[PDB]
Amino acid sequence: GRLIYTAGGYFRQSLSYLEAYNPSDGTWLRLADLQVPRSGLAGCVVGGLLYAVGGRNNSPDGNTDSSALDCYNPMTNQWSPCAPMSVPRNRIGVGVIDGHIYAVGGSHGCIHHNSVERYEPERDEWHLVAPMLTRRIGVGVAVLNRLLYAVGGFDGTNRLNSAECYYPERNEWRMITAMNTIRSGAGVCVLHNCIYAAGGYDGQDQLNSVERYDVATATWTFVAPMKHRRSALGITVHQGRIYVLGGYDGHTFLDSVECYDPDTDTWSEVTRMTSGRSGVGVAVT
Ligand SMILES: COC1CC2(C1)CN(c1cc(Cl)c(C(=O)N3COc4c(cccc4-c4cc(N5[C@@H]6CC[C@H]5COC6)c(C(=O)O)cc4F)C3)c(Cl)c1)C2
C-alpha cells in the first residue's frame, strides 16, 4: 500500500504540515511538521524516503527563499536535514532519475534560475549539471524515457508555453514542442508514457485545462479539463490515476483534491485536504 504525501504550502503564511492521504479508505494521517515552514517547494521519493526541496518561508517576520533539502522517513516519522543546494530555489520543479534528485530552476529573490543541480542520496552531495536553455520558475518537471523535461513556468519577463528536455548521458538540453497553452505554476506529471500539464496561469486567467504530451508524435493534446481552475497545485500519480491537490484560483486557497482516470478521461473530486492551501510539495510512497 502507498500513500499520497503533501508537505508545506501556503495559507496566510508558509506552512509546515506533512499529511498523508490514503486513497483506499479516504483517511488523512497528520505526520511530523517540517522543521521550517515552506511554500513553493517540490516533493519527491527515493528509496522509500520523502524529500522536501527548496521553497520559501513567507512569515509575518520576513520572506526567505530556501536552498534546503530535508528528508522524511515514514518508518521513523522524523525529518533530517540533508546537504543544501548551491542556491535557494523557490517555485522549484524536481524530477528523479536512477535515485538521483534534479532540482530545476526556481527563484532566489529577483533571480530566475536556468541552473539545474543533481543530488546523490548515496553521498549526500549536490552538483550542478548543464543549465536549461530558459530561466524557469513555477516550472513543471517530468521524467520519461530516462530524460528530464522542464515544462512551462515564468522566465522573469514572460509566462511560458515552451518546454525542454535534458539528456543525462550527454549532459545537454534541447527545446521540445511547446504546449498549446502558456502555463506558469501548472502541475506536471507522467502517466502511461505521457506527460500531463494541468492548470497553471496563462498570464491572464487561472486554468482548468489539461494537456498531454505524446512522445512518438511530439504533440500536446487537450484531455478533460479539471472541475476547479488552479495554479500552484500539488500533483502526483497513484495507481494509474493523477491526483491534483489544492492550489490558488485567484480568489480561494483550495482544499479540493481531484482525481483523473485516463481510461474514462474524467476528473472526479475525491476528498478535501484538511485545510485549503497552495504551493505544496507532493510525492507517493
Ligand atoms: C489577499 O491577496 C493576496 C492573496 C495572495 C494575494 C497571496 N497569494 C499567494 C501566495 C503564495 Cl505564497 C502562493 C504560493 O503558493 N506560491 C507562490 O507562487 C507559486 C508557488 C508554487 C508554484 C508556482 C507559483 C507561482 C504562482 C504564480 N501566480 C499566478 C498563479 C498563482 C499565483 C498568483 O496568481 C497568478 C505565478 C505567476 O504569476 O505566473 C508563478 C508561479 F511560479 C508557491 C500563491 Cl499561489 C498565492 C495570492
Curated annotation (Swiss-Prot):
Broadly expressed, with highest levels in skeletal muscle. Changing residue 106 to C: In a lung adenocarcinoma patient; somatic mutation; strongly reduces interaction with NFE2L2/NRF2 and reduces repression of NFE2L2/NRF2-dependent gene expression. Non-enzymatic covalent modifications of reactive cysteines by electrophile metabolites inactivate the BCR(KEAP1) complex. Accumulation of fumarate promotes the formation of cysteine S-succination (S-(2-succinyl)cysteine), leading to inactivate the BCR(KEAP1) complex and promote NFE2L2/NRF2 nuclear accumulation and activation. Nitric oxide-dependent 8-Nitro-cGMP formation promotes cysteine guanylation (S-cGMP-cysteine), leading to NFE2L2/NRF2 nuclear accumulation and activation. Degraded via a proteasomal-independent process during selective autophagy: interaction with phosphorylated SQSTM1/p62 sequesters KEAP1 in inclusion bodies, leading to its degradation. Kelch repeats lie at residues 3-48, 49-99, 100-146, 147-193, 194-240, 241-285. The record marks 110 as: Sensor for electrophilic agents. Changing residue 91 to A: Loss of interaction with NFE2L2/NRF2. Abolishes repression of NFE2L2/NRF2-dependent gene expression. Loss of interaction with PGAM5. Does not affect interaction with SQSTM1/p62. The modification S-cGMP-cysteine is found at residue 110. It comes from the Eukaryota. It is found in: Cytoplasm; Nucleus. Changing residue 10 to A: Loss of interaction with NFE2L2/NRF2. Strongly reduces repression of NFE2L2/NRF2-dependent gene expression. Loss of interaction with PGAM5. Substrate-specific adapter of a BCR (BTB-CUL3-RBX1) E3 ubiquitin ligase complex that regulates the response to oxidative stress by targeting NFE2L2/NRF2 for ubiquitination. KEAP1 acts as a key sensor of oxidative and electrophilic stress: in normal conditions, the BCR(KEAP1) complex mediates ubiquitination and degradation of NFE2L2/NRF2, a transcription factor regulating expression of many cytoprotective genes. Component of the BCR(KEAP1) E3 ubiquitin ligase complex, at least composed of 2 molecules of CUL3, 2 molecules of KEAP1, and RBX1. Interacts with NFE2L2/NRF2; the interaction is direct. Forms a ternary complex with NFE2L2/NRF2 and PGAM5. Interacts with (phosphorylated) SQSTM1/p62; the interaction is direct and inactivates the BCR(KEAP1) complex by sequestering it in inclusion bodies, promoting its degradation. Interacts with NFE2L1. Interacts with BPTF and PTMA. Interacts with MAP1LC3B. Interacts indirectly with ENC1. Interacts with SESN1 and SESN2. Interacts with HSP90AA1 and HSP90AB1. (Microbial infection) Interacts with ebolavirus protein VP24; this interaction activates transcription factor NFE2L2/NRF2 by blocking its interaction with KEAP1. Belongs to the KEAP1 family. KEAP1 contains reactive cysteine residues that act as sensors for endogenously produced and exogenously encountered small molecules, which react with sulfhydryl groups and modify the cysteine sensors, leading to impair ability of the BCR(KEAP1) complex to ubiquitinate target proteins. The Kelch repeats mediate interaction with NFE2L2/NRF2, BPTF and PGAM5. This is Kelch-like ECH-associated protein 1. The lineage of its organism: Eukaryota, Metazoa, Chordata, Craniata, Vertebrata. The chain holds residues 325 to 609 of 624 of the full protein.
